[PDB]
Amino acid sequence: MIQRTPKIQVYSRHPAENGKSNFLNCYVSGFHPSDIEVDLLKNGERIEKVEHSDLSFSKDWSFYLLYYTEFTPTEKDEYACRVNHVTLSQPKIVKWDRDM
Amino acid sequence: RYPLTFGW
Amino acid sequence: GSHSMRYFSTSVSRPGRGEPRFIAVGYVDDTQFVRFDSDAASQRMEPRAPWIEQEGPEYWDEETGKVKAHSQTDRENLRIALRYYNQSEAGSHTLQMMFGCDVGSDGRFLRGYHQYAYDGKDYIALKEDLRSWTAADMAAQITKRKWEAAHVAEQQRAYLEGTCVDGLRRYLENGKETLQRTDPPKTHMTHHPISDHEATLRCWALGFYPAEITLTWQRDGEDQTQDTELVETRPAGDGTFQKWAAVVVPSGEEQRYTCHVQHEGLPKPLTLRWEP
Amino acid sequence: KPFLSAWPSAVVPQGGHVTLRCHYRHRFNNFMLYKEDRIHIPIFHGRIFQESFNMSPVTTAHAGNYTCRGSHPHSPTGWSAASNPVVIMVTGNHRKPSLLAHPGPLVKSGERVILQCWSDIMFEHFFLHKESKDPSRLVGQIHDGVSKANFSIGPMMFALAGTYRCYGSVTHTPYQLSAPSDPLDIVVTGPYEKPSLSAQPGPKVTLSCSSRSSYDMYHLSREGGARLPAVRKVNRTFQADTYRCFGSFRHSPYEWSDPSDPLL
Ligand SMILES: *[C@@H]1O[C@H](CO)[C@@H](O)[C@H](O)[C@H]1NC(C)=O
Ligand SMILES: *[C@@H]1O[C@H](CO)[C@@H](O)[C@H](O)[C@H]1NC(C)=O
Numbered sequence: 001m002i003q004r005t006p007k008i009q010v011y012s013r014h015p016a017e018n019g020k021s022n023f024l025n026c027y028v029s030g031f032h033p034s035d036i037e038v039d040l041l042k043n044g045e046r047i048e049k050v051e052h053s054d055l056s057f058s059k060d061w062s063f064y065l066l067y068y069t070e071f072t073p074t075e076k077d078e079y080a081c082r083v084n085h086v087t088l089s090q091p092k093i094v095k096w097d098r099d100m
Numbered sequence: 101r102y103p104l105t106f107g108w
Numbered sequence: 109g110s111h112s113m114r115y116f117s118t119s120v121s122r123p124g125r126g127e128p129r130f131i132a133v134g135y136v137d138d139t140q141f142v143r144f145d146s147d148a149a150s151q152r153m154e155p156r157a158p159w160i161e162q163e164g165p166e167y168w169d170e171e172t173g174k175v176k177a178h179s180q181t182d183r184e185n186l187r188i189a190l191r192y193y194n195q196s197e198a199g200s201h202t203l204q205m206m207f208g209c210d211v212g213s214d215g216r217f218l219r220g221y222h223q224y225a226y227d228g229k230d231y232i233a234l235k236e237d238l239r240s241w242t243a244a245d246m247a248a249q250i251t252k253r254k255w256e257a258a259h260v261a262e263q264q265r266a267y268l269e270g271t272c273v274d275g276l277r278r279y280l281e282n283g284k285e286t287l288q289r290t291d292p293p294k295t296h297m298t299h300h301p302i303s304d305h306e307a308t309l310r311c312w313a314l315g316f317y318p319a320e321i322t323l324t325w326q327r328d329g330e331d332q333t334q335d336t337e338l339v340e341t342r343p344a345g346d347g348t349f350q351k352w353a354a355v356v357v358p359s360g361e362e363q364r365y366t367c368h369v370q371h372e373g374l375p376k377p378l379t380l381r382w383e384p
Numbered sequence: 385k386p387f388l389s390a391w392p393s394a395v396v397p398q399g400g401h402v403t404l405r406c407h408y409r410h411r412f413n414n415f416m417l418y419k420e421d422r423i424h425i426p427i428f429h430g431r432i433f434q435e436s437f438n439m440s441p442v443t444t445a446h447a448g449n450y451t452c453r454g455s456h457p458h459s460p461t462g463w464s465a466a467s468n469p470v471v472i473m474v475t476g477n478h479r480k481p482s483l484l485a486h487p488g489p490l491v492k493s494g495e496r497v498i499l500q501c502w503s504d505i506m507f508e509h510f511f512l513h514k515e516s517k518d519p520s521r522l523v524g525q526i527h528d529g530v531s532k533a534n535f536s537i538g539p540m541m542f543a544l545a546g547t548y549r550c551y552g553s554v555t556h557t558p559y560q561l562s563a564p565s566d567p568l569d570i571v572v573t574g575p576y577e578k579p580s581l582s583a584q585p586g587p588k589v590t591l592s593c594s595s596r597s598s599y600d601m602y603h604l605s606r607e608g609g610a611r612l613p614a615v616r617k618v619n620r621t622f623q624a625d626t627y628r629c630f631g632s633f634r635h636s637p638y639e640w641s642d643p644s645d646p647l648l
Contacts, residue, residue, distance in 0.1 A: 034120055054145070056140070
């Protein structure tokens with residue numbers, strides 16, 4: 001069976017300005033099957049009120065989801081994204097790189 | 101407008 | 109320009125984990141406007157874009173009827189597939205359907221799609237002639253024969269050229285200031301030392317719509333199509349998109365590389381050079 | 385909330401096999417079961433089921449309306465929330481009823497059909513089940529010395545065609561159903577194109593229905609009720625070997641084509 005591993009991208013909606021309210025996004029894409037577990041982490045702890053888009057896919061039938069939340073970037077508060085899938089024996093942590 | 105789907 | 113309307117549907121079976129789930133989304137170009145979830149409480153075709161909220165109750169009743177019919181249909185097609193591949197009734201399987209049409213600036217039909225997939229592999233697809241079917245495996249040839257016997261391709265051709273493109277024109281009109289308004293990409297560049305002998309240059313493009321965009325790195329003129337690293341165009345969360353391209357440059361040759369951005373909202377392509 | 389399911393079906397005969405699975409926290413973790421009579425009281429003296437509960441051999445006391453709760457140790461309460469209700473109905477108690485199709489089991493696509501379940505026994509509850517989700521229910525109406533029901537099935541689609549059975553329950557033991565009535569196969573005709581009928585040597589005997597469509601099996605029937613695989617001819621035509629015939633596809637036995645024209 002075709003089982004693809006999700007590609008993860010953690011980033012901000014707008015250009016990151018410290019102390020200015022913004023949105024953190026974890027864009028997971030290219031995965032199959034659609035059963036995927038995505039959470040947004042702040043200092044390692046899960047964030048509440050994490051919205052998710054509606055399940056859709058691309059022309060290669062691989063699914064894609066966006067998980068987004070409101071936050072205020074702080075230099076001491078490091079954000080990240082945790083993604084678990086049937087193709088992942090270990091929840092992948094992708095840290096949000098502001099300097100990227 | 102949503103299509104008309106048929107059984108396999 | 110050339111616009112499009114698509115519908116994507118996913119039916120999944122989770123034995124012991126839940127009831128079969130049917131999620132359907134409608135997109136025009138890159139903007140989603142409808143959704144239907146078989147697990148929400150409404151059980152109705154829901155709006156997901158402001159320019160579609162202006163439709164009457166007859167529209168939502170018709171669309172909810174057709175999408176719930178598709179829900180039941182694909183829920184049963186899962187079971188039929190179980191016997192087509194002689195699969196166990198305890199496994200979890202997926203059924204996807206992509207339907208839609210393309211139109212040009214002339215507003216006339218261009219190309220129509222009606223394709224299915226089972227567990228991520230192609231199943232049955234509608235040819236561009238809109239008169240024959242492409243079956244991938246044997247189980248799909250079964251469905252192809254049933255469908256040739258039901259004269260379904262004729263009905264689908266009538267619908268793809270009829271209600272589909274008429275509705276697409278109506279959608280493009282009802283949100284002209286939303287779907288036919290291009291947004292230019294805002295561009296900048298970042299420089300990070302990879303090591304003492306090389307660094308990495310990253311050209312960004314933020315807040316552009318539609319999601320179509322081209323980022324190309326060029327050293328002294330010629331392209332670095334294979335020396336560049338591209339990421340997938342990602343959404344910002346507000347209808348705009350982001351993308352960046354990164355190439356590794358030898359320490360001192362940063363002036364020899366440059367990044368070109370081409371986009372519909374840009375009147376003329378942009379040339380970006382990194383300076384300290 | 386957890387998800388409660390019954391394998392292989394919530395309609396199980398006595399002495400058969402049935403299993404309640406409680407999915408919570410992405411695992412068939414430890415769970416406690418509950419009935420509707422004692423909502424906030426766990427059954428089996430508060431039994432904590434490590435694995436899934438196999439209720440075989442299925443007896444009478446094993447029927448009823450169940451809900452599970454999984455173990456959520458990191459929460460105010462030691463357990464989860466109430467799961468979806470699941471009704472286990474045990475069959476094979478009273479005598480079987482009868483199931484008739486009005487006007488007939490050969491239903492035209494998009495049309496309606498009345499499955500009438502009746503019996504001389506004044507069954508209070510009649511239940512209709514297709515051979516695989518929650519069954520339909522109607523109260524019995526007493527007339528002429530027998531209890532009857534009128535199950536409406538329609539508009540006809542490929543998902544509504546199959547083997548139907550109907551059961552009856554007594555007034556004070558609703559979860560204990562009667563034996564299964566004789567299975568009635570409801571097949572749908574269409575929207576597949578009708579074939580052509582021919583019967584060598586003539587109408588004065590061997591079936592022969594021909595169609596360009598590659599029907600895997602031709603079925604024949606006359607005005608009075610009293611399979612036949614096919615093969616292609618040199619014209620690529622798939623022939624067979626008041627009369628009417630239908631075309632059917634393999635693995636889809638309950639979905640037939642439009643009726644062929646009636647022939648003398
Ligand atoms: C089973 O019990 C639940 C919880 O009390 C109730 O809501 C449900 O209706 C019952 N099922 C029936 C009556 O079929
Ligand atoms: C039920 O269906 C039968 C089918 O012939 C019909 O005659 C009858 O009027 C219907 N109603 C009752 C109450 O039997």
